[PDB]
Structure formats: C-alpha cells, structure tokens
Amino acid sequence: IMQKSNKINDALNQHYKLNVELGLVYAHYAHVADDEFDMPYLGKFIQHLSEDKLGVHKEYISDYFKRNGMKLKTDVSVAVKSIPSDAKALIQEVYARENEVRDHVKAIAKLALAEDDYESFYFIQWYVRDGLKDLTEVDDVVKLFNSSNDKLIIEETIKEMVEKEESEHEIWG
Amino acid sequence: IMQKSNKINDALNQHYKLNVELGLVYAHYAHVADDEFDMPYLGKFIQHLSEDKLGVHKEYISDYFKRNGMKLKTDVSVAVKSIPSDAKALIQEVYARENEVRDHVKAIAKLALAEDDYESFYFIQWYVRDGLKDLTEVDDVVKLFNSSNDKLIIEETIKEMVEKEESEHEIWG
Amino acid sequence: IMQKSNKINDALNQHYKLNVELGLVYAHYAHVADDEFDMPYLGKFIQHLSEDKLGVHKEYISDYFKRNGMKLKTDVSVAVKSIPSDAKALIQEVYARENEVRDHVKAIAKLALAEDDYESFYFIQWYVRDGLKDLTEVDDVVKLFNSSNDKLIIEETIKEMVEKEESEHEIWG
Amino acid sequence: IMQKSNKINDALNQHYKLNVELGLVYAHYAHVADDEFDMPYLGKFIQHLSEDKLGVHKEYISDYFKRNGMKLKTDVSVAVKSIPSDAKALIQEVYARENEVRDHVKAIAKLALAEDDYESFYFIQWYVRDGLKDLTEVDDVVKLFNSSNDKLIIEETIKEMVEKEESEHEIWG
Amino acid sequence: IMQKSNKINDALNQHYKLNVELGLVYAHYAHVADDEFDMPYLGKFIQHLSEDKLGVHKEYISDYFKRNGMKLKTDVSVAVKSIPSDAKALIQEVYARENEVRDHVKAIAKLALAEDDYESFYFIQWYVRDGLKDLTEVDDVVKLFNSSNDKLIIEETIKEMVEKEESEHEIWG
Amino acid sequence: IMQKSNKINDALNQHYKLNVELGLVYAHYAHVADDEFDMPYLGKFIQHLSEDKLGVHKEYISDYFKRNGMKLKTDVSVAVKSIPSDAKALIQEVYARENEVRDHVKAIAKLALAEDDYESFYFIQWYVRDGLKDLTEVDDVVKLFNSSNDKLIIEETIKEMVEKEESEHEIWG
Ligand SMILES: [Cl-]
Ligand SMILES: [Cl-]
Ligand SMILES: [Cl-]
Ligand SMILES: [Cl-]
Ligand SMILES: [Cl-]
Ligand SMILES: [Cl-]
Ligand SMILES: [Fe+3]
Ligand SMILES: [Fe+3]
Ligand SMILES: [Fe+3]
Ligand SMILES: [Fe+3]
Ligand SMILES: [Fe+3]
Ligand SMILES: [Fe+3]
Ligand SMILES: [Fe+3]
Ligand SMILES: [Fe+3]
Ligand SMILES: [Fe+3]
Ligand SMILES: [Fe+3]
Ligand SMILES: [Fe+3]
Ligand SMILES: [Fe+3]
Ligand SMILES: [Fe+3]
Ligand SMILES: [Fe+3]
Ligand SMILES: [Fe+3]
Ligand SMILES: [Fe+3]
Ligand SMILES: [Fe+3]
Ligand SMILES: [Fe+3]
Ligand SMILES: [Fe+3]
Ligand SMILES: [Fe+3]
Ligand SMILES: [Fe+3]
Ligand SMILES: [Fe+3]
Ligand SMILES: [Fe+3]
Ligand SMILES: [Fe+3]
Ligand SMILES: [Fe+3]
Ligand SMILES: [Fe+3]
Ligand SMILES: [Fe+3]
Ligand SMILES: [Fe+3]
Ligand SMILES: [Fe+3]
Ligand SMILES: [Fe+3]
Ligand SMILES: [Fe+3]
Ligand SMILES: [Fe+3]
Ligand SMILES: [Fe+3]
Ligand SMILES: [Fe+3]
Ligand SMILES: [Fe+3]
Ligand SMILES: [Fe+3]
Ligand SMILES: [Fe+3]
Ligand SMILES: [Fe+3]
Ligand SMILES: [Fe+3]
Ligand SMILES: [Fe+3]
Ligand SMILES: [Fe+3]
Ligand SMILES: [Fe+3]
Ligand SMILES: [Fe+3]
Ligand SMILES: [Fe+3]
Ligand SMILES: [Fe+3]
Ligand SMILES: [Fe+3]
Ligand SMILES: [Fe+3]
Ligand SMILES: [Fe+3]
Ligand SMILES: [Fe+3]
Ligand SMILES: [Fe+3]
Ligand SMILES: [Fe+3]
Ligand SMILES: [Fe+3]
Ligand SMILES: [Fe+3]
Ligand SMILES: [Fe+3]
Ligand SMILES: [Fe+3]
Ligand SMILES: [Fe+3]
Ligand SMILES: [Fe+3]
Ligand SMILES: [Fe+3]
Ligand SMILES: [Fe+3]
Ligand SMILES: [Fe+3]
Ligand SMILES: [Fe+3]
Ligand SMILES: [Fe+3]
Ligand SMILES: [Fe+3]
Ligand SMILES: [Fe+3]
Ligand SMILES: [Fe+3]
Ligand SMILES: [Fe+3]
Ligand SMILES: [Fe+3]
Ligand SMILES: [Fe+3]
Ligand SMILES: [Fe+3]
Ligand SMILES: [Mg+2]
Ligand SMILES: [Mg+2]
Ligand SMILES: [Mg+2]
Ligand SMILES: [Mg+2]
Ligand SMILES: [Mg+2]
Ligand SMILES: [Mg+2]
Ligand SMILES: [Mg+2]
Ligand SMILES: [Mg+2]
Ligand SMILES: [Mg+2]
Ligand SMILES: [Mg+2]
Ligand SMILES: [Mg+2]
Ligand SMILES: [Mg+2]
Fold first, then answer.
1. Cβ atoms within 10 A of the Cβ of B115, count?
2. How close is the nearest chain B Cα to the Cα of C85, in Å?
3. Helix, strand or coil for residue A166?
4. Which of A43, D103, F63, F98 has the maximal Cβ count within 10 Å?
5. How many CA atoms lie within 13 A of C73 on its CB side?
6. Ligand 63 centroid vs E62 CA: distance in angstroms?
7. What is the 3-state secondary structure (H, E, C) of chain C?
8. By three-state DSSP, how is residue D105 classified?
9. A17 C-alpha vs ligand 22 centroid, how far in Å?
10. Contact A44, A162 (CB under 8 A)
11. Which residues of C touch D54 (CB under 8 A)?
12. CA distances from D34 to A67, A126, C165, E45, E130 (A)
C-alpha cells in the first residue's frame, strides 16, 4: 500500500535539478547585474531569487522524498556561456525562466491527479502558488525598465522592493 | 597599473566551481545521512556545511571579482553516482574532501606570492584559515564514530554540536 | 637583533607623505564638488575620504614607528593648480589616485618579504585591504555618473551612501 | 553689490595655509613628544591641537568661501627639519606659534573693518576668541615644566587636562 | 596530501617551551618586583605577562597541533639563579627577552613561507603582532624609570596601566 | 623574633616546584586526552586542573613568602617522555599524582607543628583541604571508566562536571 509513484519521483527529481541550475544561473546574473551593468540593487534582487531556488525550492523536495520513499538524484550540468546584453534583457530572461517554472509545475500537478497521488498534489500546491508569486515579483522589476530610462531611478525603486519587510499576500504569499 | 592576474583569476574560478559542486554533493549527503542512515543530526551538520560552501565560500569570490576586474565563470558539472556505504564512511568522505580544500587553497596562496598579488594573498587568508576550521569540525564528527558503536549516542553529541551557539576561535574562528 | 629596515622606513615615510598630500588635495576637491559643481553630497564623500587619509592612514604609520625605532619624517609639498572640468572627472581623478595607492602598497608588501620584515608585512595588510576597499567606494560613485545624466539623482544616491551607518565587509571592511 | 574683498580672500587663504602647515608640524611634534621624550600625554595634547588646526580651523574658511564667492587655494609647503631639544622647548615652540596666530588674526580683523566687510569681521571673531583660548591651553602646559622637574608628575597633570570632559568658558570657550 | 612540516613542528615546540619558561621566570620576577623592590604594581604587570605566556601563547600552539597532526612535546628546564639588581634592570631584562621573542617569531614566519605552509604562516601572524604589542607594553614601563627617580610616582603610573580596561589597537591589539 | 623556619621554607619551595611541574604535565595530558584519545571534555577537566596547579596553588606560596621573609626559588625540570596508553590510565595517573600531593602536604603540616610555626600550619590548611577535594574530583572521573565502556557516554558525564557552576562543599570546598 502507498507505493510511491515512479513518474512523480522523476518529475520531482527533474524539478530539483531545475531549481539548482536556475539558482546557479541567477547567482551569475546577480554578479553581472552589479558588476557589468552598474545595478547593485538589481543584483540583490536576483541574488535573493538565487537563494530562494537553491534553498527552500530544493529543500522541500528532499524533505518530501524522505517521508515517502522517493529517491533523490543529484545530477547537475550548467554553464553560463552567454549573458544578456543589458539589464532590461537580463530581467526579461529571468522572467522567461520563471514562466517556464509555472509550466513545469502545472505538469506535475496534472500528473499527480492522473496517478491519484494526493499527497503529491498537496505538496505541489506550494510550487503552484510560488510559480505565480515569483513571476509577479520579477514582473514588478521588468516594468521599471519600461517606465524609466534612468538606471538610478530604477535602482531606487528596486532598493525599496528588496528592503521592504516581506509581506505575504493572503493567497499568493 | 594594477592589472588583474589571469592565473589567479583562473585558480579562483576553479575554487568557485569546487565550492558550488562540493555544496551540491553535501546537500545530497545530508539527505542520505537522514534518510538512509537514520542520523538526522548528522544530516543537519552536513547541510550546514553545504550551505557554507554554496554561501559565503562562493560569495566572497564573486565579490572580489567585482572589485578587481576579474571575470566570473559559471561552469558546473556534478553527479552523485555512488554513495558511501554507511555513516562513518560518509563523514570520512567529507573529511577527505575538506583536506583537498586545504591543498587547493595552499596552491592559491603560493601563486599569489609568485604573482606579487598581495590583495589576493590577503583575500585567500580567509580560505586558508577556513580550510583548517572546517576540517576540524568534520574531524570532531569522525571521532565520534570511533568512540561509540551506538548511533543514537553519536547523534546526541552531534546535536549539541549543531545546536551550540557558534563560538569563534581567536585565530581559526 | 630586530634592527629596523631602512628601506621599509623610507617606503613608509613616502606613504605617510602620500596620505597627507592626498588628503589635502581631497579637501580641495570636496570644496570644489560642493562649491563649483553643485554637488554637496559628492563633497561630503570626498571630505570623508580626505579625513581618512589624514587620519588613520597617517596615524598608524606614526604609531608603528614609535614601536620599532623607525624615524618619522615630515616633508610635504602640495599645490592644487588645476582642477578637473566637471564632477565626473573629479571622481575619476580620485579613482586614479586610489589605484596608485594600491600599487604603492603592493610594493611595500613585496619589500617587506624581501627584507624578511614580518612585522612590516603584517602592518601593511591593513593598507593592502584598504587599498581595495577605498577604491571600491570610489568606484561606486563613478558608476553613478555613467548611470544617470541628472546631477540631483546622482546626489540622492550619494546621500544614502554617505549617510548609511558604516558596515564592514568580513574580508575587506 | 556684495562683491567679495580680494584682500580678505588672500588673507584667509594665507590663514588656511597656516592652519594646514601648523597642524602637520604639530602632528610631528606629537610623535616626538611620545616617541623621543617619553611623554605620551603631552603627545596627545599636541595631537588634539593638530586635529583642531586641520579640522575646524580650516573647514570654516572653506565653508565661508562657498557662501561668498571667495576662492580657495591649496598651496602647502612644510618640512620639519629640526626639532626642539626637550619637551619644555617643544611646548614653548608650540606657544610661540600660537602667539603668532593671534597676531595674524588681529590683522585680518583690522583689514575687515578697513574694507567694510562686516560679514568677514563677524567670521573672524571665532578666530579672535580661539587665538586666546588655544594659547591659554598651551600656557597651562608650559607652566607645568616650570612647576616640576619630574616628567611623570607633569604627565599626570596633562592626563587630567586631556581627559577632562571639555568645558566652554562663557566668553572664550 | 597536507602532511605536516616537521621543521615547523620543531620550531613551534621550541616556541612552546620558550613561552613556558619565560612565564615561569616572569612569575619569579613578579615576586621579586613586589617583595624585594617594593613595587607591587610593577609586580602585577610582570605577573600579567607571566600569565599571558603560560596561557594563550602556549595554548594556541597546542590547539594548532591538534588540528594538523603535529606532535606536542613537553620538555622544560628553567632556573632563576641570578636576579637583576634593581627594578629598572628587572624590566629591562624583560624587554630584552621580549625582543628575542620577536626574533624567534620572525624565523618561524620565514620558515613557513620556505616550506609553503600557509596555514602556519597564518597561525604565526598572531605571534608576529603580539611580539610587538608585548614589547610596546614593556617599553612603556621602561620609560618610566627614565622619567622619574621616585619609585612611588612610577608605581602610580603602572597602576593606571594595569588597571585600565584593556583596549585593542586596530592593528596591534 | 618571628624568624622564618628554613625547613618550612624548603618544604614550601619544593611544593611550589611540584605544583609547577604537575601543571605542565597536566597541560600535556589535557592535549593528549583530546588529541590522541578523542575525549575533549576529559581534556578540559585535566586542563582546569593544570591551571589550578599553576595558578592558585603556586600563587599562595609566593604570597606567603612575601609576608614572612621566606625566599622563593624557581627551579623547574620536567619532561613528558612517556604517556599512558589510554584514557583510563591517563586519569588513573592523575589520581596517583594527587594522592602523592596529599602525602606531601601531610608532611608539611606535621613539620609546621614540630617547628611551632602556627602561621605555616594555618597556611597549609588550605592545601590539606584541597588535597582531598582535588582527589575527589579526579576520582569522580576515574569511576566513569569503570562504569561504562562507551567513551561518548563518559564524555557526556564529564561535560556536565566541567560545565556545572562550581559549588563549594561547606568543609572541603
Ligand atoms: Cl499508483
Ligand atoms: Cl603581474
Ligand atoms: Cl634586515
Ligand atoms: Cl570693497
Ligand atoms: Cl612540505
Ligand atoms: Cl624555630
Ligand atoms: Fe522541472
Ligand atoms: Fe556593490
Ligand atoms: Fe522572497
Ligand atoms: Fe524542509
Ligand atoms: Fe531518500
Ligand atoms: Fe559547455
Ligand atoms: Fe548560456
Ligand atoms: Fe545596462
Ligand atoms: Fe536592449
Ligand atoms: Fe499527466
Ligand atoms: Fe520562490
Ligand atoms: Fe528619487
Ligand atoms: Fe580549487
Ligand atoms: Fe528528520
Ligand atoms: Fe559554520
Ligand atoms: Fe560578499
Ligand atoms: Fe565581473
Ligand atoms: Fe554522468
Ligand atoms: Fe559519485
Ligand atoms: Fe549507517
Ligand atoms: Fe564500514
Ligand atoms: Fe605558484
Ligand atoms: Fe567554511
Ligand atoms: Fe607611497
Ligand atoms: Fe552645502
Ligand atoms: Fe570610510
Ligand atoms: Fe594609532
Ligand atoms: Fe620615532
Ligand atoms: Fe607651485
Ligand atoms: Fe594640480
Ligand atoms: Fe559638473
Ligand atoms: Fe566631461
Ligand atoms: Fe622588493
Ligand atoms: Fe582608507
Ligand atoms: Fe595667517
Ligand atoms: Fe604611547
Ligand atoms: Fe580643544
Ligand atoms: Fe563648516
Ligand atoms: Fe569656491
Ligand atoms: Fe626643504
Ligand atoms: Fe624645521
Ligand atoms: Fe625631554
Ligand atoms: Fe632645556
Ligand atoms: Fe588693515
Ligand atoms: Fe582652536
Ligand atoms: Fe600623583
Ligand atoms: Fe622559540
Ligand atoms: Fe603586595
Ligand atoms: Fe595583556
Ligand atoms: Fe585555544
Ligand atoms: Fe597531538
Ligand atoms: Fe642549575
Ligand atoms: Fe638565572
Ligand atoms: Fe629597586
Ligand atoms: Fe642600576
Ligand atoms: Fe627559513
Ligand atoms: Fe602576549
Ligand atoms: Fe611537595
Ligand atoms: Fe576539541
Ligand atoms: Fe576547580
Ligand atoms: Fe595570592
Ligand atoms: Fe621574597
Ligand atoms: Fe630528559
Ligand atoms: Fe615521562
Ligand atoms: Fe582511549
Ligand atoms: Fe587499559
Ligand atoms: Fe616533622
Ligand atoms: Fe586545587
Ligand atoms: Fe545521554
Ligand atoms: Mg524509474
Ligand atoms: Mg482519475
Ligand atoms: Mg586566460
Ligand atoms: Mg618573489
Ligand atoms: Mg637611509
Ligand atoms: Mg626570501
Ligand atoms: Mg588677487
Ligand atoms: Mg572706515
Ligand atoms: Mg623530526
Ligand atoms: Mg618559494
Ligand atoms: Mg637552608
Ligand atoms: Mg611540640
């Protein structure tokens, strides 16, 4: 009874890998944001995101696996070989990656229902919610580049964003 | 004047890579320590170490690069394909890896002097000190497996270790 | 035994002189930043730097000399005969001078090792670290002029910089 | 209307120069007081005076210039080529220099009235008062050398002087 | 890999021995300072120094050895067979011994670099700094005997020295 | 009148020597307890004892000598050439040495009465009491090795012992 789904096990190992590799890319993008583009607050924003991916996003999968018999796999391959040309494009790339996260998560949820794995459907709810939350935070920064042509003005707004004491939306938080 | 050393740049990119990959391996080893070996406090110890490697150890390199013109490279390849057979061997493997850290760091320091890069010699001092500190903490756990054959007794001692409020040795801390 | 190095004595007298003269130039540049360029916060930044050079940078040399038998020399000659054309160039000049500081300090460290003067190598470590720290702070201001064409926006960012309660980086601080 | 006095501008540039050079000499004399004469508290007294000259004494001139259109000049030439033979003579030399300060200040005040520059006459009042205050503090130390032949007794009295929480005389303070 | 240097092991065993024997001599000198020379505060100064040598100076070596595989040796031979004739000479002897400490430490640092032992070079930095700090504190007392011929006046100054709440110099502290 | 006993003077010089040499041996044994036997809490126990011997045990003799005219002698010879084979034997050796302390102290007390030296009989009372107290504390550790074969269990008990806030027995404390 209660035999773990091998299909969910694979999908969640692939999502663990995605969050590790994303976090490593974001750490690089945070360096570049500060170093090459002269936007240290944009750097801090991306760095916070790197740490989210390499922290809780991966941790919760490992924890879940310990509880249900699923096997963890660690297989990572990532290389930053090209960087976006400017800051606007850097954050737009981050946006595209977060949009893909939402698509991957949707798939896992759909799979959990197909496999009648209600514990996994429950688990993924955090990721479903976070898919949108994280995208929204990134979108809030993307908007800035369309609203001013002054990098320092944009930076002042990012500063408040990163320095605000984090509030949780009742639903998406 | 003050042109960055390409040799130091490469050695520090390789050490960034080493700390990323080590941290990912340790995250896996922390999972296994808890999940397979029934030693959650040993897991927490290795997890703290994973976070050290993927946190400050890498961050300080990126920060340094921003200050001196050195280029960051992100190129990561890691796969955990075999795990040690028991807990004793798991921590002994961690020990071996920390010993290798000390050897890599020694090389960077020697190189900094050869290149007359005193800013880099200063920078690496943190890593020289930490090489030993981290090894010592790991050694403290290795010792336990040679001092008791009861996994729960060992776990009780690791618990105090991980839960003690961190003290800094005047020299190695 | 323990006879002071005459070569280190000379190099450190020359560095005392450099820090005095730099501080006097920076005091003038701080006046001009406010008075001629309408950037009082940029003025305060350069003034803080003037006081750093004429304070601790020189004080620590005098203190060291008292401890080891080295002789202090006071020989100062400085005249500000031309000023940079605008604020961007003013801070870029400050940058160039800080870069030269790093080069002079490198030389002292190299000399200390050649003379087997380990007390002097220890002493200069503060200056090695500070060379980079001070350059970084100046670079943070230079960046601003490349990130906005509005002097008041730049000034608002410098204001936060000068008014932030000073934090020390674990390594460079 | 309200065109700045070129004569006052020159006199105040010369007084800026005097305060810079005095402060650099006093910094040397403070070193010697401690290092050569074995009187660290006498050193601290002279050092406090060095910092007064290189601090507020010069700062107030720069500030004034910013307000009225006067031009700041930085032209400094100072070399300590001979030092007084003992501590008594060191402080007596400091006294002579402070007496000369009072004479220079008198001249500026007289000039301000001749030029009908009431803003400058107001400004110099601080310096008129301080001329005497600073001389008095130096005289208080000179007296000590005429009142004891024991350097440590003198040092104990200087210690209280430098360590007393500064009080301001209603008139001269 | 990371095999301990036998040469550094010997040099540090010899420095452990030096600090033990120095501390025992200083304990005797502290007794004599009080008992024979009627200078209890001078006694307390030397006693504090005895405890420094027999405390942290030796402890840090033992700690280091535990971390790196080096072997501790305990081999002590000390006899106080002659004492200096008066207090001035007692502290001058302490001074000579501290000067020799600095010379021994210099040698260890030089050796660490020759052996490419960067962990040992890091370790010895504490001792390099302390060599000078301790000498300075002793010099501060030596000076007193050249500044007064009254033993009680000297004692009053030593009292403040030993009773001041210890401050750390940014570099030498 | 009140001429010091030369016999008591010698016995107390020999006891000063014994406490110095014991303390140096115990410092070595504390190192070995931690380093070789993997028992850091046992190390801390022996280290506390080293510091007791080299602290108050010797200090009180020096103090007494200052008060009564007795002469202090410093003559120390100690070499740790063999170490006990295991931890049990290490603490048993410490026990044997403490038992010998009690025997030496008994002799001094007996001598004080024979010499009608009541001040010395009073003085030695501290040492008579401490002979037993210190032996008892050591016995409490010896017992542990006879009560468990698990080094970590023993270590947990030693930890409480060394970390308990010290209580004084009404008689032996
Ligand atoms: Cl199923
Ligand atoms: Cl080079
Ligand atoms: Cl030399
Ligand atoms: Cl006019
Ligand atoms: Cl070697
Ligand atoms: Cl008798
Ligand atoms: Fe995925
Ligand atoms: Fe930054
Ligand atoms: Fe967040
Ligand atoms: Fe979790
Ligand atoms: Fe598992
Ligand atoms: Fe590739
Ligand atoms: Fe790429
Ligand atoms: Fe850009
Ligand atoms: Fe674009
Ligand atoms: Fe499906
Ligand atoms: Fe998230
Ligand atoms: Fe604004
Ligand atoms: Fe490496
Ligand atoms: Fe658990
Ligand atoms: Fe840690
Ligand atoms: Fe950092
Ligand atoms: Fe970069
Ligand atoms: Fe593979
Ligand atoms: Fe593997
Ligand atoms: Fe196991
Ligand atoms: Fe095994
Ligand atoms: Fe090399
Ligand atoms: Fe670490
Ligand atoms: Fe220089
Ligand atoms: Fe202003
Ligand atoms: Fe600063
Ligand atoms: Fe200083
Ligand atoms: Fe000097
Ligand atoms: Fe000129
Ligand atoms: Fe010029
Ligand atoms: Fe401008
Ligand atoms: Fe321009
Ligand atoms: Fe050189
Ligand atoms: Fe600085
Ligand atoms: Fe003047
Ligand atoms: Fe001093
Ligand atoms: Fe004042
Ligand atoms: Fe002002
Ligand atoms: Fe002006
Ligand atoms: Fe000249
Ligand atoms: Fe002169
Ligand atoms: Fe004198
Ligand atoms: Fe004279
Ligand atoms: Fe006039
Ligand atoms: Fe003044
Ligand atoms: Fe007095
Ligand atoms: Fe030595
Ligand atoms: Fe006394
Ligand atoms: Fe001290
Ligand atoms: Fe220690
Ligand atoms: Fe050892
Ligand atoms: Fe002998
Ligand atoms: Fe002797
Ligand atoms: Fe005397
Ligand atoms: Fe004499
Ligand atoms: Fe050598
Ligand atoms: Fe010391
Ligand atoms: Fe005895
Ligand atoms: Fe330990
Ligand atoms: Fe005790
Ligand atoms: Fe006492
Ligand atoms: Fe005596
Ligand atoms: Fe022997
Ligand atoms: Fe032996
Ligand atoms: Fe054992
Ligand atoms: Fe046995
Ligand atoms: Fe008897
Ligand atoms: Fe005791
Ligand atoms: Fe227990
Ligand atoms: Mg499968
Ligand atoms: Mg269905
Ligand atoms: Mg290359
Ligand atoms: Mg070379
Ligand atoms: Mg010369
Ligand atoms: Mg050499
Ligand atoms: Mg003119
Ligand atoms: Mg008139
Ligand atoms: Mg050998
Ligand atoms: Mg070499
Ligand atoms: Mg006799
Ligand atoms: Mg009788």
1. 16
2. 24
3. coil
4. A43
5. 14
6. 16
7. CCCCCHHHHHHHHHHHHHHHHHHHHHHHHHHHHHHCCCCHHHHHHHHHHHHHHHHHHHHHHHHHHHHHCCCCCCEEEEECCCCCCCHHHHHHHHHHHHHHHHHHHHHHHHHHHHCCCHHHHHHHHHHHHHHHHHHHHHHHHHHHHHHCCCHHHHHHHHHHHHHCCCCCCCCCC
8. helix
9. 26
10. yes
11. 54
12. 71, 68, 34, 21, 21
Q: What whole-number distance in Å separates Cα of residue E136 and Cα of residue B24?
A: 49
- Choose among B141, B138, B166: nearest CA to B154: B141
Percentage helix, strand, coil for chain E under 3-state DSSP, each rounded to 5: 75, 5, 20
Least Cα separation, residue C80 to chain D (angstroms): 6
Measured CA to CA, the distance from residue F105 to residue F61 in angstroms comes to: 13
Q: Which of E64, E67, E122 is the closest to B128 by Cβ?
A: E122
The first and second tokens of residue E39, run together, are 């200078």
Reduce the DSSP state of residue A75 to 3 states and report it: strand
Take residue E124 and report the two structure tokens written for it. 């010895």
DSSP-assigned states of every residue in B14-48:
HHHHHHHHHHHHHHHHHHHHHHTTS-HHHHHHHHH
* CA atoms within 13 Å, Cβ hemisphere of C13: 16
Using the beta-carbon criterion (under 8 Å), do E1 and B109 form an inter-chain contact?
A: no
A38, A40, A153 member nearest C146 (Cβ): A38
Indicate left, alpha or beta for E116 from its phi (over 0: left) and psi (-120 to 50: alpha). Answer: left
Residue D34 burial class via C-beta count within 10 angstroms: exposed 0-12, middle 13-18, buried 19 and up: buried
Query: Are E72 and F34 an interchain contact pair (Cβ–Cβ within 8 Å)?
Result: no
This structure was determined by X-ray
Token code pair at residue D63: 């500030």
* Token representation of residue B146: 């040679």
Instruction: Break chain A down into helix, strand, coil percent, rounded to 5.
Output: 75, 5, 20
F103 alpha-carbon distance from chain centroid: 12
| CA atoms C142, C147, C152, C157: torsion sign | negative
Q: What angle do CA D154, D157, D160 make, to 5 degrees?
A: 150
The burial of F87, by beta-carbon neighbours within 10 Å (0-12 exposed, 13-18 middle, 19 or more buried), is given as buried
* Closest of F100, F93, F89 to residue F14, by C-alpha: F100
Q: Using CA of residue B66, residue B68, residue B71, residue B77, what is the dihedral sign?
A: negative
- In eight-state DSSP terms, residue B170 is T
- C-alpha closest to that of E73 among E11, E22, E133, E24: E11
According to DSSP, residue B55 is labeled: I
Nearest to B77 among A32, A62, A77 (CB): A77
> In this structure, what token pair is assigned to residue F75?
């003559």
* DSSP assigned state of B76: E
Window 130-169 of E: residues touching D by CB (8 A cutoff) are 140, 143-144, 146-150, 153-154, 156-157
CB contact under 8 A, C31 and D72: yes
Tokens of E147: 């500044």
How far is the C-alpha of E172 from the C-alpha of E136, rounded, in Å?
A: 10
Q: Phi first, then psi: what are they for C69, rounded to 5°?
A: 90, -5
The CA distance from E11 to the nearest CA of chain F, in Å, is: 18
Q: How many CB atoms lie within 10 A of CB F105?
A: 22
Nearest chain C CA: its distance from E2 CA (Å): 24
Instruction: Tell me the resolution in Å.
Output: 2.1
CB-CB under 8 Å, E157 with D153? no
Phi (first) and psi of residue B79, to 5 degrees: -140, 125
**Identity of the residue numbered D102:** R
Tell me the chain C residues in contact with residue E105 when contact means C-beta distances shorter than 8 Å: 118
Q: Ligand 11 centre from A135 Cα, in Å?
A: 30
Q: Which chains lie within 8 Å of chain C at 3 or more CB pairs, if any?
A: A, B, D, E
**The one-letter amino acid at F143:** K
CA distance E117 to E111: 8
